[PDB]
Amino acid sequence: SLIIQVSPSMDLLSQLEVERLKKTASSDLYQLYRNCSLAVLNSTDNSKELLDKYKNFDITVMRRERGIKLELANPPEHAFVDGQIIKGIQEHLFSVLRDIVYVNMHLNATHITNLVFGILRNAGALIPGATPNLVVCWGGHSINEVEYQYTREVGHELGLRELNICTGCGPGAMEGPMKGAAVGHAKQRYSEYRYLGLTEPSIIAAEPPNPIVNELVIMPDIEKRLEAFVRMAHGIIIFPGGPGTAEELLYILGIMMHPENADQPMPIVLTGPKQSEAYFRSLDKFITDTLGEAARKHYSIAIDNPAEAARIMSNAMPLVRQHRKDKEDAYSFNWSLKIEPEFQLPFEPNHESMANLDLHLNQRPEVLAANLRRAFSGVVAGNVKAEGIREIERHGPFEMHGDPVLMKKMDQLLNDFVAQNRMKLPGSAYEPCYKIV
Template identity: 55%
Template sequence: MTDQIDTRLPTVDARIYARGGLDILSRGEVAKLRDASTGIHDLLRGCALAVLTSGSASDDPRAARELYPDFDIEVQQQDRGVRIELRNAPAMAFVDGELIRGVADLLFAVVRDLAYTTIELREGGSRDLLSSEGITDAVFGLLRNARILYPTDPNLVVCWGGHSINREEYVYTKQVGYELGLRSLDICTGCGPGAMKGPMKGATIAHAKQRRRRTRYIGITEPGIIAAESPNPIVNNLVIMPDIEKRLEAFVRLGHGIIVFPGGVGTAEEILYLLGILLREENADLPFPLILTGPTSAAPYFEQIDRFLRLTLGEIATSRYEIIVADPAKVATRMAEGIARVREHRKAHRDSFFFNWSIDIPLAFQQPFVPSHEAMAALDLHHGRKPHELAADLRRAFSGIVAGNVKEDGMRRIEEFGPFEIHGDDDMMQSLDALLRAFVEQRRMKIAGEYKPCYRVVT
């Protein structure tokens, strides 16, 4: 008889009480969070588990659930406020039996945002999600409810980039973050590892040197992403948007400038989203600093991105971004100068410093895209379209690949029906295929393991 080895990871049962960002919930909100029939409880459980495994190196959305199959969470309302019961929670989130404070704050952010979404943004809620104005109002409401809209001078830099980057690129993101922090600029990212963590880590040192006490390291995610990209431990303001489109709008409305580091399909999606908006005639005079940067070794990466953008969106697209290689101080200086122009523009046009109302985001960029095989095959990727219209469909193509790579729904579709097919003009498809192949060869699709493409570019 052979003794069986217990391979289960250590877990903890705990009871914790809300403070700060989550004071109370209504009985209706608590009931919805506990209702297993609507899928909200499963969503809460998945997002909570992602937070409790913060710092995980995996980008498989199923990994944490498989490691902690018996984990559960229950939200309760009582006279003294909100109480959360955790059962079989990952022991890595605790120290001497106490939940790490930063993890607790992120956990309550999860409860806060999902509670708000279930009441305000679900069918029958008070928000109009069929109009552009209504969607923007919903994004504003979520950010305000998360208490991250501060009427202070513009200083928030959004940093985009891949979760799967090499060591040299990661160190470079920290160097840029350090230079931004020395100039008293705060950081907002997608909240995960890699290029989302590095700028925050660099900024923490610089902020400490400048004796800045009120610092913001904002992480904006959505339920389909957070399970694959757990929040990094530096995030001190977490916001969970309902879908990728509202997440992208939140970045653009909240940030005062954007820096793009090397990344994969998710980063390409973000670039196309922003350029598609900035290339609209309505936004032609709107200052919005956009810098693409990386170490010397990343120069070929940005050259390929630049060629792809020129081919698809035209030379006009290059006027909206600047590429800076291997010069963190220059990146930070140019960003600070750009944000100063943003400040003056908003003062002149009486726009708020904390939420960019002036930028025009059309409904086509706001409506959620469900990447089914039919929807992916139907994307209109052909020349002759207006740049912002083509950018919208290109963004959807990359969004579908992201879903097939790291989102559980997308992964299930691929397992059942095979790879997505992407059609378009030959030269565009050849350029897209070359770009995606480069992402695979440079291991930008997955953190670990062999990558099996979830797509097929038809040429």
């Protein structure tokens, strides 16, 4: 077979740290690490049937004289420019290894936040000396040219303002802002730029990191990745997207409506091009019809104005600075943010647990947000997660019930995603993994 060697950015490892990543009987670790490493070599589509395409891929970790070398059997050939692996992709492979190893060397509420902290610290993601300048960007993996161009323009304007970018991984509004920021930073001579990509193992093949990401972090699960986003964020920019972006929006809004979070200054701007006005009218209406009028104080909307969204982020930075100091908190990690256990407790989407969601309009707005967060994660899981497609493939779409006022508003929004092509990367038509009862 074809064998490539990869040389190292990264620490020495012990035999203890590394023996767990041998192909072995009655452990799942190697295949987790292999799949994550495979995904990184594949920056095509959004299904996890790419594991069927590269079934003869394998990876070996070697402890040698200058640290770790990796040997790749049959890697995807589009990792390669002129027979050599793009240096960014090389670095992602070591980020994979670093984070898988950390987490497995380190197997309630304080415990979870502390683990999220530890992972991020081990990754080098929390820079002690840094002034607040980190903007989390959220938006669709499946987006048209006009929306993509708009994300690039916003990225550009953040770049000019010496701001850094944290996103998820994948195509669309996950790579657009970094590409624009590449230009904006170079205009502004900002050499210390950071493009942070946060992923987890069940999502990573579906949405592989761009090699422009210069700090990849693999979180253990979706909820810990979401906690990482909101604890590192200094501002939040939200683009148009499908159910993944909705999940992320409802996560932060459930958090922000807590009374303890009322002096948390973190700006959220929903932003899009002129043609996303109808998307944003519909989305704003959904939020206020479900979570109440109270939610609207936590965000603002900017249509057709990249510089404004980025100006808002930029202007808010001294606010974030002052507030961290008032709380005796760190700049780089928001300890003082109150996240309730209903946002922290891992949700494994199957038919049973999708049914058992209390999606009724007589809850606390926070707990309802926590529930719809879970709802939208199940939609994601049924679409893109290899385990989650299997449960649809044997037992049909996930069954979902509640207040019919909410249920019909949810179904309209979900169908909007289908109609605007937000569910899937386009190339046959989408069939729901969901069923609203």
